[PDB]
């Protein structure tokens, strides 16, 4: 009975990703004191990057999408952070190696305040004989310092749309690995998580920039 008065809506992803048919979501039909659009606004959808990018190699990454506007039957969402799956992180953390983590708060050109989390692990050499590949605490601090510096530069210059485009190929991770190789070889350098602390007030003009005419 209660489900007989619910209208299904389609979820649309930004133009950054390939597949825009994220899925479907329902909500109670519009009624006095309860507008349907209000109920759907700011709803957070968690969908794997593999579905958005149609690539199974990205199954380890999850994308947070929040609804911004409801144009007709389509719900327009936007990037709202990303994080690893539980299995992915647990697979990277192994004994007999050093774990290095870093975080930084940066502001993009679109007034978006982000908190990027980086992660890396020490890498053995092909001819290495000792079982461990630990790094000295001084080396860890040097590596962590370069992680923060690189993350600031990549985010302080580009906008949110361009910054997200760097996460899909993990361009930032490769740059961090290249820069820190002179200190200690690293493996599995990723941007583990991204948080949206403060977002600029809604602007329909900018929302439609990354969304096409779904009519």
């Amino acid at each position: 009975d209660p489900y007989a008065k619910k209208d299904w809506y389609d979820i649309k992803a930004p133009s950054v990703f390939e597949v825009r048919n994220v899925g479907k979501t329902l909500v109670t039909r519009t009624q006095g004191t309860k507008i349907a659009s209000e109920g759907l606004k700011h709803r957070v959808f968690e969908v794997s990057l593999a579905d958005l990018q149609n690539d199974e190699d990205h199954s380890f990454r999850k994308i947070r999408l929040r609804a911004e506007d409801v144009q007709g039957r389509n719900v327009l969402t936007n990037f709202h952070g990303m994080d690893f799956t539980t299995d992915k992180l647990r697979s990277l953390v192994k004994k007999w190696q050093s774990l290095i983590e870093a975080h930084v708060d940066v502001k993009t050109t679109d007034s978006y305040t982000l908190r990027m989390f980086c992660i890396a692990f020490t890498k053995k050499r092909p001819n290495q004989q000792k079982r461990t590949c630990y790094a000295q605490s001084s080396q860890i601090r040097q590596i962590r310092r370069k992680m923060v510096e690189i993350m600031r530069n990549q985010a302080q210059s580009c906008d949110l749309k361009d910054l997200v485009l760097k996460f899909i190929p993990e361009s930032i991770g490769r740059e961090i690995e290249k820069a820190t190789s002179s200190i200690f070889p690293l493996q599995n350098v990723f941007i583990r998580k991204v948080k949206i602390l403060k977002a600029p007030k809604f602007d329909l003009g900018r929302l439609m920039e990354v969304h096409g005419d779904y009519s």
Binding site: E56, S59, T85, D87, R90, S91
Partner: protein
């Protein structure tokens, strides 16, 4: 009578080690003394892999694994048969079994 050279734990050149809580009963035990086992297994049991795979909604998909690190106290490890009482000669063998 002293039963073990290590005193039943693994502590050298340090005074105090913070304890952990037994995964079974919650008993406090020093981390260096607790019996630790890292269990990695498929999130889907082998008896259900065939059914789940047939119902998969994707052409290709790898079932994620379940990583769980178990820390037991001495009493729970013995009772659960994680470890067994060994003869005086076999107590010194530190290499994991086959």
């Amino acid at each position: 009578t002293f039963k073990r050279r290590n005193g039943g734990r693994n502590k050298h050149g340090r005074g105090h080690v913070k304890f952990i809580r037994c995964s079974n009963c919650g008993k406090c035990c020093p981390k260096d003394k607790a019996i630790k086992r890292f269990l990695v297994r498929n999130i889907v049991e082998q008896a259900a892999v065939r059914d789940v795979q047939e119902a998969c909604a994707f052409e290709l998909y790898t079932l994620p694994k379940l990583y769980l690190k178990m820390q037991y106290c001495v009493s729970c490890a013995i009772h659960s048969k994680v470890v067994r009482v060994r003869s005086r000669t076999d107590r010194r063998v530190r290499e994991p079994p086959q």
